[PDB]
Design an enzyme around this catalytic site. Structure first.
Site, PDB file in Angstrom:
ATOM      1  N   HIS A 163      -3.266   5.066  -4.262  1.00  0.00           N
ATOM      2  CA  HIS A 163      -4.326   6.068  -4.070  1.00  0.00           C
ATOM      3  C   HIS A 163      -3.865   7.284  -4.892  1.00  0.00           C
ATOM      4  O   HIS A 163      -3.253   8.216  -4.344  1.00  0.00           O
ATOM      5  CB  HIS A 163      -4.446   6.485  -2.607  1.00  0.00           C
ATOM      6  CG  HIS A 163      -5.217   5.545  -1.723  1.00  0.00           C
ATOM      7  ND1 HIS A 163      -6.517   5.163  -1.980  1.00  0.00           N
ATOM      8  CD2 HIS A 163      -4.887   4.976  -0.541  1.00  0.00           C
ATOM      9  CE1 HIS A 163      -6.953   4.389  -0.995  1.00  0.00           C
ATOM     10  NE2 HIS A 163      -5.975   4.233  -0.124  1.00  0.00           N
TER      11      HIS A 163
ATOM     12  N   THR B 133     -22.411   7.078 -13.093  1.00  0.00           N
ATOM     13  CA  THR B 133     -21.363   7.922 -12.573  1.00  0.00           C
ATOM     14  C   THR B 133     -20.033   7.170 -12.517  1.00  0.00           C
ATOM     15  O   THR B 133     -19.032   7.673 -13.047  1.00  0.00           O
ATOM     16  CB  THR B 133     -21.714   8.495 -11.178  1.00  0.00           C
ATOM     17  OG1 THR B 133     -22.882   9.301 -11.262  1.00  0.00           O
ATOM     18  CG2 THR B 133     -20.565   9.345 -10.606  1.00  0.00           C
TER      19      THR B 133
ATOM     20  N   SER C 168       0.865  -1.211   0.000  1.00  0.00           N
ATOM     21  CA  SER C 168       0.000   0.000   0.000  1.00  0.00           C
ATOM     22  C   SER C 168       0.895   1.253   0.000  1.00  0.00           C
ATOM     23  O   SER C 168       1.414   1.716   1.057  1.00  0.00           O
ATOM     24  CB  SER C 168      -0.955   0.015   1.202  1.00  0.00           C
ATOM     25  OG  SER C 168      -1.997   0.944   0.952  1.00  0.00           O
TER      26      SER C 168
ATOM     27  N   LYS D   3     -12.206   2.704  -4.498  1.00  0.00           N
ATOM     28  CA  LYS D   3     -13.478   2.391  -3.808  1.00  0.00           C
ATOM     29  C   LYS D   3     -14.668   3.044  -4.473  1.00  0.00           C
ATOM     30  O   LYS D   3     -15.439   3.769  -3.831  1.00  0.00           O
ATOM     31  CB  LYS D   3     -13.368   2.774  -2.327  1.00  0.00           C
ATOM     32  CG  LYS D   3     -12.328   1.928  -1.611  1.00  0.00           C
ATOM     33  CD  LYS D   3     -12.244   2.295  -0.068  1.00  0.00           C
ATOM     34  CE  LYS D   3     -11.420   1.255   0.728  1.00  0.00           C
ATOM     35  NZ  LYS D   3      -9.904   1.281   0.440  1.00  0.00           N
TER      36      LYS D   3
ATOM     37  N   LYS E 287      -0.752  -1.317  -4.534  1.00  0.00           N
ATOM     38  CA  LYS E 287      -2.045  -0.616  -4.392  1.00  0.00           C
ATOM     39  C   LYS E 287      -1.745   0.877  -4.355  1.00  0.00           C
ATOM     40  O   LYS E 287      -0.868   1.336  -3.583  1.00  0.00           O
ATOM     41  CB  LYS E 287      -2.751  -1.057  -3.097  1.00  0.00           C
ATOM     42  CG  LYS E 287      -4.161  -0.519  -3.022  1.00  0.00           C
ATOM     43  CD  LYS E 287      -4.846  -1.031  -1.779  1.00  0.00           C
ATOM     44  CE  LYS E 287      -4.381  -0.341  -0.485  1.00  0.00           C
ATOM     45  NZ  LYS E 287      -4.704   1.158  -0.482  1.00  0.00           N
TER      46      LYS E 287
ATOM     47  N   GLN F  82      -7.574  -0.989  12.699  1.00  0.00           N
ATOM     48  CA  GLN F  82      -7.257  -2.066  13.620  1.00  0.00           C
ATOM     49  C   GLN F  82      -6.361  -3.041  12.842  1.00  0.00           C
ATOM     50  O   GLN F  82      -6.645  -3.330  11.682  1.00  0.00           O
ATOM     51  CB  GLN F  82      -8.540  -2.769  14.087  1.00  0.00           C
ATOM     52  CG  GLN F  82      -9.652  -1.816  14.564  1.00  0.00           C
ATOM     53  CD  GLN F  82     -10.914  -2.545  14.930  1.00  0.00           C
ATOM     54  OE1 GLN F  82     -11.117  -2.884  16.099  1.00  0.00           O
ATOM     55  NE2 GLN F  82     -11.747  -2.840  13.935  1.00  0.00           N
TER      56      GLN F  82
ATOM     57  N   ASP G 207       1.042   4.466   0.094  1.00  0.00           N
ATOM     58  CA  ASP G 207       0.291   5.626   0.492  1.00  0.00           C
ATOM     59  C   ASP G 207       1.259   6.778   0.723  1.00  0.00           C
ATOM     60  O   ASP G 207       1.536   7.153   1.888  1.00  0.00           O
ATOM     61  CB  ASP G 207      -0.502   5.312   1.760  1.00  0.00           C
ATOM     62  CG  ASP G 207      -1.570   4.244   1.529  1.00  0.00           C
ATOM     63  OD1 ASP G 207      -1.950   4.108   0.357  1.00  0.00           O
ATOM     64  OD2 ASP G 207      -2.032   3.560   2.488  1.00  0.00           O
TER      65      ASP G 207
ATOM     66  N   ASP H 226      -6.860   1.927  -5.623  1.00  0.00           N
ATOM     67  CA  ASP H 226      -7.799   1.703  -4.502  1.00  0.00           C
ATOM     68  C   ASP H 226      -8.811   2.842  -4.461  1.00  0.00           C
ATOM     69  O   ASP H 226      -8.812   3.674  -3.535  1.00  0.00           O
ATOM     70  CB  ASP H 226      -7.005   1.611  -3.206  1.00  0.00           C
ATOM     71  CG  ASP H 226      -7.875   1.291  -1.991  1.00  0.00           C
ATOM     72  OD1 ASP H 226      -9.056   1.004  -2.158  1.00  0.00           O
ATOM     73  OD2 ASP H 226      -7.388   1.427  -0.863  1.00  0.00           O
TER      74      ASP H 226
ATOM     75  N   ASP I  19     -20.734   4.734  -6.224  1.00  0.00           N
ATOM     76  CA  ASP I  19     -21.816   5.579  -6.766  1.00  0.00           C
ATOM     77  C   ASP I  19     -22.681   4.752  -7.708  1.00  0.00           C
ATOM     78  O   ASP I  19     -22.428   3.584  -7.938  1.00  0.00           O
ATOM     79  CB  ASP I  19     -21.195   6.751  -7.523  1.00  0.00           C
ATOM     80  CG  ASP I  19     -21.985   8.043  -7.372  1.00  0.00           C
ATOM     81  OD1 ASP I  19     -23.265   7.980  -7.333  1.00  0.00           O
ATOM     82  OD2 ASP I  19     -21.360   9.124  -7.259  1.00  0.00           O
TER      83      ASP I  19
HETATM   84  O1  S5P Z   1     -28.078   7.737  -4.075  1.00  0.00           O
HETATM   85  C1  S5P Z   1     -27.550   8.617  -4.951  1.00  0.00           C
HETATM   86  C2  S5P Z   1     -26.736   9.633  -4.485  1.00  0.00           C
HETATM   87  C3  S5P Z   1     -26.225  10.588  -5.377  1.00  0.00           C
HETATM   88  S1  S5P Z   1     -25.325  11.928  -4.747  1.00  0.00           S
HETATM   89  N1  S5P Z   1     -26.502  10.487  -6.689  1.00  0.00           N
HETATM   90  C4  S5P Z   1     -25.914  11.432  -7.655  1.00  0.00           C
HETATM   91  O2  S5P Z   1     -26.811  12.353  -8.211  1.00  0.00           O
HETATM   92  C5  S5P Z   1     -26.651  12.345  -9.627  1.00  0.00           C
HETATM   93  C6  S5P Z   1     -27.912  11.766 -10.241  1.00  0.00           C
HETATM   94  O3  S5P Z   1     -27.954  12.221 -11.585  1.00  0.00           O
HETATM   95  P1  S5P Z   1     -29.149  11.963 -12.620  1.00  0.00           P
HETATM   96  O4  S5P Z   1     -29.505  10.497 -12.444  1.00  0.00           O
HETATM   97  O5  S5P Z   1     -28.519  12.276 -13.975  1.00  0.00           O
HETATM   98  O6  S5P Z   1     -30.167  12.865 -12.059  1.00  0.00           O
HETATM   99  C7  S5P Z   1     -25.386  11.574  -9.971  1.00  0.00           C
HETATM  100  O7  S5P Z   1     -24.270  12.497 -10.110  1.00  0.00           O
HETATM  101  C8  S5P Z   1     -25.200  10.641  -8.785  1.00  0.00           C
HETATM  102  O8  S5P Z   1     -23.792  10.351  -8.514  1.00  0.00           O
HETATM  103  C9  S5P Z   1     -27.371   9.456  -7.125  1.00  0.00           C
HETATM  104  O9  S5P Z   1     -27.714   9.368  -8.422  1.00  0.00           O
HETATM  105  N2  S5P Z   1     -27.870   8.541  -6.266  1.00  0.00           N
HETATM  106  O1  S5P Z   2     -11.059  -2.109   5.011  1.00  0.00           O
HETATM  107  C1  S5P Z   2      -9.995  -1.525   4.427  1.00  0.00           C
HETATM  108  C2  S5P Z   2      -9.787  -1.591   3.058  1.00  0.00           C
HETATM  109  C3  S5P Z   2      -8.617  -1.010   2.514  1.00  0.00           C
HETATM  110  S1  S5P Z   2      -8.323  -1.269   0.831  1.00  0.00           S
HETATM  111  N1  S5P Z   2      -7.736  -0.353   3.315  1.00  0.00           N
HETATM  112  C4  S5P Z   2      -6.544   0.330   2.741  1.00  0.00           C
HETATM  113  O2  S5P Z   2      -5.341  -0.310   3.066  1.00  0.00           O
HETATM  114  C5  S5P Z   2      -4.356   0.613   3.427  1.00  0.00           C
HETATM  115  C6  S5P Z   2      -4.064   0.357   4.904  1.00  0.00           C
HETATM  116  O3  S5P Z   2      -2.877   1.081   5.234  1.00  0.00           O
HETATM  117  P1  S5P Z   2      -2.126   0.817   6.620  1.00  0.00           P
HETATM  118  O4  S5P Z   2      -3.070   0.949   7.814  1.00  0.00           O
HETATM  119  O5  S5P Z   2      -1.167   1.943   6.574  1.00  0.00           O
HETATM  120  O6  S5P Z   2      -1.467  -0.504   6.527  1.00  0.00           O
HETATM  121  C7  S5P Z   2      -4.935   2.009   3.255  1.00  0.00           C
HETATM  122  O7  S5P Z   2      -4.573   2.587   2.002  1.00  0.00           O
HETATM  123  C8  S5P Z   2      -6.422   1.773   3.277  1.00  0.00           C
HETATM  124  O8  S5P Z   2      -7.048   2.861   2.570  1.00  0.00           O
HETATM  125  C9  S5P Z   2      -7.984  -0.373   4.681  1.00  0.00           C
HETATM  126  O9  S5P Z   2      -7.139   0.211   5.515  1.00  0.00           O
HETATM  127  N2  S5P Z   2      -9.103  -0.925   5.208  1.00  0.00           N
END
Ligand code: S5P
Ligand code: S5P
Lengths: 255, 255
Positions: free
Chosen positions: A60, A98, A34, A91, A58, A208, A36, A89, A94
C-alpha cells in the site's frame, strides 16, 4: 486439478501468472506478504528477510511516510534477488479515464514497478479497459476484487458473478481474483484470499479471519494474503514460515 | 423543499455541509470543478480563476505529477479567498484498518487538507468507521458512492439502498452522496452528480454524460461535478460560468 507448475504452462496462461506460478512451485510458497508498514526501512527489511518465504509482496504505497521511487528500485532488487512479484493493492475503482492516469502517473507511477495491481468491478468494465491501456504495453497484470473479507461486504451473489465475467472477458490483462474462495472454474485464473490468520478472530473495524487450511483447503483458493498475522508477531521470519507451510500443505493435500 | 441557505440551518446538518450550503446560496453556485490535471501550476491557476464560480474543487491528488504539501497549502489559501470546499476524490474502498492510514498518512496526508472525501460502500460499514476515526476529530465530512455514471456500473438496486442506509447510520461523518439522482429523502444530505456535460456524449472508456438540467432539474441532485466539459475548453472561466448558470437555474426551477 493441476499443480502450480503445470498451470504455469497452460496455453491461455498470462505471462505474469506463469512467472508467479513457476516461482510458487520452485520455492514451495503460496504466501503473499501484506507489508502494511509506514517506513521504507521496515518495508525493505521485511522484504529482504521474508523474500525467500513468499511468492509475492502486496504493498500500500500510499501509506509509506517516506515513499520515493528509489525505495521501489531497492524493492525491485529484492524481488529479483529473492524471486517474488510486487503487487500494489491500489483497488482502482473509478471510471476508465481516471484510473488510466492513476495507474501510470502522479508521484507513485505504479505501473513502472508493480507486476500486479487490483481493481473493484463496481464502475463496470470501463475500469479494466482504462487500466489495460497502460498495463498491456507494460506487460502487467490485474486482479479483480470478487469478494471481500470484511463484515457487511456487498461483493456477493450477482456482484461476484459480474466480477467473474469481467475477468473472463479480459483475460489478456486480468490474471485472477481477490476472493474468499474459488469463484472461477478456469485454471488460468489465480485466487488470492486476504483475511487470513491461524487463530480465529478479527479486528475492531470489520475484518474477519479464517485459517489457511480453510481458505486454501476447503474453499479452494491458491494464495493467502497475510498482514498483521505476520507483521505484528515478534519473529516475522518464523511467522512467515509458519504461514507458508500452512498454505503449502493445504495446497498439496487438496492436490 | 428548502433553498440551500435554509438547508444550511437544518438541526441535524453537518458543519461541513452547513458551510458549503451557505457559500452555495451566497455565491449562486452549485458547480463543483473536477480539476482533472497533472500540473500543480495548472491546478492553482484554475482554482484562482474559477474559484468565484464554484462551490467546490474536486481533486485527484494521485495524478498530480508535481504534488507537494505546499501545493495543497496554496490551494487552501485560494479555497479560503474565494470560498469553496476542497474535495479529494480518493474513493476509499478497503477495510477500515487500511483506509484509516490511507486517509491520514502517507505522502499525501489527505485528512490534513481535504474538507471532504468519498468512499465506496462495497467493503461494508467498516470503511466508514475507519475513515471516521481520523475524520471526525478533524471536523471533516465524507460522501458515500451510491450510483456511478459509467457504463456497466454495479451500484444499483440493493447496492444503492445499502449506501443510503450506511449514510443515514453514520450521519455524524457522512454528509451526502455521489449519485446520479436524489437517493435519499432527507434534506440534510447532499447529492453530488458526475458525468455532466452540456452536449450529448460519452468517452471511449465508459463515461456517460447527461445535462445539468436533467441531473439537477428532473433527477433532483444538488451539485454537478464537471471535468472535461470545462477543462478541455479554451476558455475555462466562460465554460465554468455556463455550467454554473445551467445548474443554478435548474435548481431555482425545482424550488
Ligand atoms: O460515478 C462517477 C463518480 C465520479 S466522482 N466521477 C468523477 O468525476 C469526474 C468526471 O469527469 P468528466 O467525465 O471529465 O466530467 C472524474 O474525475 C471522475 O473520477 C465520475 O466520472 N463518475
Ligand atoms: O477483502 C479484502 C481485500 C484485501 S486485498 N485486503 C487487504 O489485505 C490486508 C489484510 O491485512 P491483515 O488483516 O492485517 O492480514 C490489508 O492490506 C487489506 O487492505 C483485505 O483485508 N480484505
Amino acid at each position: 486439478e493441476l499443480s502450480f507448475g503445470a498451470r504455469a504452462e497452460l496455453p491461455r496462461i498470462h505471462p505474469v501468472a506463469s512467472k508467479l506460478l513457476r516461482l510458487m512451485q520452485k520455492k514451495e510458497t503460496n504466501l503473499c506478504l501484506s507489508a502494511d508498514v509506514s517506513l521504507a526501512r521496515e518495508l525493505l527489511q521485511l522484504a529482504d528477510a521474508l523474500g525467500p518465504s513468499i511468492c509475492m509482496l502486496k504493498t500500500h504505497v500510499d501509506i509509506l511516510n517516506d515513499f520515493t521511487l528509489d525505495v521501489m528500485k531497492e524493492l525491485i532488487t529484492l524481488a529479483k534477488c529473492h524471486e517474488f512479484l510486487i503487487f500494489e493493492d491500489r483497488k482502482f475503482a473509478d471510471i476508465g479515464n481516471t484510473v488510466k492516469k492513476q495507474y501510470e502517473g502522479g508521484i507513485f507511477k505504479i505501473a513502472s514497478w508493480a507486476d500486479l495491481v487490483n481493481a473493484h468491478v463496481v464502475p463496470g468494465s470501463g475500469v479494466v479497459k482504462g487500466l489495460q491501456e497502460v498495463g498491456l504495453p507494460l506487460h502487467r497484470g490485474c486482479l479483480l476484487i470478487a469478494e471481500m473479507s470484511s463484515t457487511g461486504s456487498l461483493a456477493t451473489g450477482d456482484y461476484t458473478r459480474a466480477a467473474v465475467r469481467m475477468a473472463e472477458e479480459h483475460s489478456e490483462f486480468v490474471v485472477g481474483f481477490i476472493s474468499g474462495s474459488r469463484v472461477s472454474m478456469k485454471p488460468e485464473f489465480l485466487h488470492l484470499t486476504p483475511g487470513v490468520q491461524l487463530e480465529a478472530g478479527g479486528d475492531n473495524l470489520g475484518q474477519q479471519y479464517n485459517s489457511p487450511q480453510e481458505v486454501i483447503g476447503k474453499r479452494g483458493s491458491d494464495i493467502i494474503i497475510v498482514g498483521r498475522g505476520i507483521i505484528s508477531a515478534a519473529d516475522r521470519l518464523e511467522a512467515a514460515e509458519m504461514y507458508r507451510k500452512a498454505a503449502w500443505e493445504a495446497y498439496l493435500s487438496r492436490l
